Amino acid sequence: VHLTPEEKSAVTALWGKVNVDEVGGEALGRLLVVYPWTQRFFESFGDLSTPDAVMGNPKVKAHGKKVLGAFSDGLAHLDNLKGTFATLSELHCDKLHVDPENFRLLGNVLVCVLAHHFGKEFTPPVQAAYQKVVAGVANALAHKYH
């Protein structure tokens, strides 16, 4: 991070306009649909074969809440973006072995979804700031491939 006083705020102010519990998962939904290999890791999970049966997996809707979960712990703990995440990265990295660029697909699609929902008010200087958090949350979970 850095977020300039003035990025800090376009960001902090879209977010509590944010219905977590149902964004958390339009996002995990959309990730297993657009980027399928990710499915390999959620077979603990259900029918994931036609797009409709994901976006209505009470199970894909549930894990996604956990995950808007920790963008939240980040969207503001932007100061170690690095330590809010040690455990999950220990988790995601040397436990499930998700390759680190599936970390960027996810914050990336999360943005497609921040945009899909707020339309015109996701001006571009306002997206530009989210590619920064995101690229940040992603440099953080990946910090144990070193």
Partner: protein, 141 residues
């Protein structure tokens, strides 16, 4: 590959984006220029500035070539050729840069088009542009 039905979600998602393709292809340069500052390197001759008439004028061009691809999609090779020699022979764009316009373009269908932008379509648009950039990068490979 790009199947019978992905070629239908795009023929259709673009169907409705019409009269606008040009405001859109320029809203997406703006977004790539702002968020991934590292692409500015190539438009040193642009006011990568916000009302900028050059970026507005180029949206029209990126959007004119997106459409010839949407039309002619069963054969991108051929139609997109000279944009695939210019981009790769004359200008040398690092190919990681297609991934990113690719993405701002979708953050744009997304923000101007909500009901048609269903998850299945979010996948076809993405499959469509992953193919425009493969064609765009091929004198490369």
């Amino acid at each position: 590959v790009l199947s019978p039905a992905d070629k239908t979600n795009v023929k259709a998602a673009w169907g409705k984006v019409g009269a606008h393709a040009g405001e859109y292809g320029a809203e997406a340069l703006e977004r790539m220029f702002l968020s991934f500052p590292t692409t500015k390197t190539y438009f040193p001759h642009f006011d990568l500035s916000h009302g900028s008439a050059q970026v507005k004028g180029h949206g029209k061009k990126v959007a004119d070539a997106l459409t010839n691809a949407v039309a002619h999609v069963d054969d991108m090779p051929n139609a997109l050729s000279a944009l695939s020699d210019l981009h790769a022979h004359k200008l040398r764009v690092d190919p990681v840069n297609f991934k990113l316009l690719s993405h701002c373009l979708l953050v744009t269908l997304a923000a101007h088009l909500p009901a048609e932008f269903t998850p299945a379509v979010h996948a076809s648009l993405d499959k469509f542009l992953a193919s425009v950039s493969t064609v765009l990068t091929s004198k490369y490979r």
